[model samples]
Target chain A: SGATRIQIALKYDEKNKQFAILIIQLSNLSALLQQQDQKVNIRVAVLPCSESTTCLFRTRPLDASDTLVFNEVFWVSIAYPALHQKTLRVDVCTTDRSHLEECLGGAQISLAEVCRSGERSTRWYNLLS
Target chain B: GATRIQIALKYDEKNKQFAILIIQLSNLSALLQQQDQKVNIRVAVLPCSESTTCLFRTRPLDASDTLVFNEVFWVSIAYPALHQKTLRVDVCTTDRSHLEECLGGAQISLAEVCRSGERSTRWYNLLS
Candidate 1:
């Protein structure tokens, strides 16, 4: 009956050369899909250039009381040989082909040849349906 | 026959400011005062003006076998106020009058008007 909403926040740690991604799911649509015995799945993907990396975990809507919260932060070090621009994507779907759904949102972030020095690191925030 | 050296670092959290101080004692003077049972005294004073503020903390040295290492970091936050300025001071001294010695170092840091926004905040690092 209603659409599910998700918000994502990104923070980079320069001292440790790592990035943290947080996902917050705001609404519940479990009851609507339960009648059909269907399942809802949410997945995260990072796209860089021509390739895309998908997260190993998927979000599933189980019941009306279910709320999805993910504090998964990932890191990429300066030791990496190349610089690149990355995009983030989040997808929601069902286990069976009966229903298919997807939402997209991303930010342009770069890995620098030389890391910036500071106590507080930079971060970006976005929302995906 | 030998002297011990100590270094101290100070940081204030209000504005996220930091200062580092290094001290090196050249010779062992324990023998000079121990034989005579004499004492040493060293003192420092801070003067405050309309533009100045004075604060103080002390330091002491013990035996040759004693090695002091302190890694103390402190913080203060802003919430209830819109504007304020804070100052910090540090002092080092000895116990006996026969070998009274002292070292002084300090930095002037502030708590500003309204905490700034953005993902990153401003911080200052100073080596005293």
Candidate 2:
């Protein structure tokens, strides 16, 4: 339901046994939402593909612009092998004056694909509702 | 001997982004092997235009006749910028003296990649 694309960077530091996830930016926002002058933010979640529970994270809210640039890096602690079974999801949401949030779109990436390459993997994902 | 490297590029139509894959390096100077040194690649895309956007330094690997990386880097670019920027790759090795030395570098014109729409793979010679 949107043209918004999410840019993210993933790096699994084997020595440190940690995952560095950089939430870069979101672009191509909907004109209707931009016209409303809403406060935009992104909610990030990590989930186990085999389970239903999720751990949440979020980006700081910013006034909607040509692009929503987060440039935030989140460090995650998890075993290397176990992380492969995980999934990363990001939801683009906006809040109105009364602080009611509406989900615009979201995207997901497999941790297995991020770690399989053994290098810093950066890419963009299409947002879907 | 002169150094040669392999790289690949892909453009994601839906996201309007480009990925540059550094595959491997070959034909490194025999002298490096004798010195028992290791090397790593520092990569970036230009014109950076005053922002350090797209910069990655790969982990070091032992220098040999051929070094394989298959490492990937990414950039979000519009069609106009994609046709005007360049990919800069530098190969650096650590000497026994504990100094970082630049073996060579390569610059790939993004215009060529944009014209073709995608690059499955290509070999480039490093400039000393």
Candidate 3:
């Protein structure tokens, strides 16, 4: 909620019958993509509201993809589900090999809310951490 | 480089491989609760990683309502496994008679969340 902003898209798979989650893009609403020339990596995650793992995709080390910048929206469907009124947690992080510099931000997504509007669901979230 | 904002891996129990990309959807009580409704549905594998894939809403998909939208669903994504990933699931509904539109979607994601692998538990706070 401080300097950086993240955007995304979520969908369900028909043929494979899975849900698609996208990392649309991220940009600095403020004037800093880095913290005082800090070299960082960016990555996003969707874990059971109950689980977290280090097994995640990381931006290439200290280069073009290594830091957050202005916005450009694109990333695709990973396709996949759950039952009951369970909750799923999605988050973004900025890091170096041995440290988590920031959370960027995350959200507490609920099944009831998406289904609330009656399908064809859409909502916006902030990436602040 | 697409810049890693974090993507996932999926295991192929039958084929013996892992999909570099994957989507894990949970909390599906809504669709299951509709079992008694008179209806027909279309669930698709959408192409691309963006919502524009469903923008025009042209092609049609078919989903068996007997499926569970109220439980845990695990998926592994592959390329050329299908022509891109067509609207993996962009639902537009009709009557139980396969007749009219009865609403078509339910989407979810967490922004400020905390998850743990040890106990399979999570927590999120929008309030800072």
Clashes of 3: 62
- Candidate 1 C-alpha lDDT tens digits along B51-87: 4222323244452223232332223333232123344
lDDT of 2 by residue, A1-99 (tens): 446788888777767777788999888777336474777888888875335333677889988875779988887776667787778988888887688
Sort all candidates by lDDT, best to worst.
2, 1, 3
TM-score of the first chain alone, every candidate: 0.48, 0.84, 0.50
Docking class of 2: incorrect
After TM-score superposition, what is the CA distance of residue B73 in candidate 3 from its true location, in Å? 34
TM-score, B chain alone, candidates in order: 0.27, 0.82, 0.27
Error of 1 at B119 (Å): 8.3
Instruction: Point out the worst 10-residue segment of candidate 1 chain B by lDDT.
Output: B38-47
Residues A26-77, model 1: lDDT tens digits = 3444422344355455555544423333333455553323354544444334
Evaluate model 2: give its TM-score: 0.48
Give each candidate's interface RMSD in Å: 9.2, 10.5, 10.6
- Model 2: lDDT of residue A95: 84
The most accurate candidate by lDDT is: 2
Model 3 agreement with the true structure over B1-128: per-residue lDDT tens digits: 11011123223444433222212222222332443443332333444345322322222223333222322223343323322333232234454355656343422132211111011122111110
lDDT of 1 at B18: 36
lDDT of each: 0.36, 0.73, 0.35
Score candidate 3 by DockQ: 0.02
Residue B59, candidate 3: C-alpha displacement in angstroms: 40
- Per-residue accuracy of model 3 over A23-118 as CA lDDT, tens digit each: 544455333344434444445333442243332444432332323442322222322234124444545544655664665455655543322111
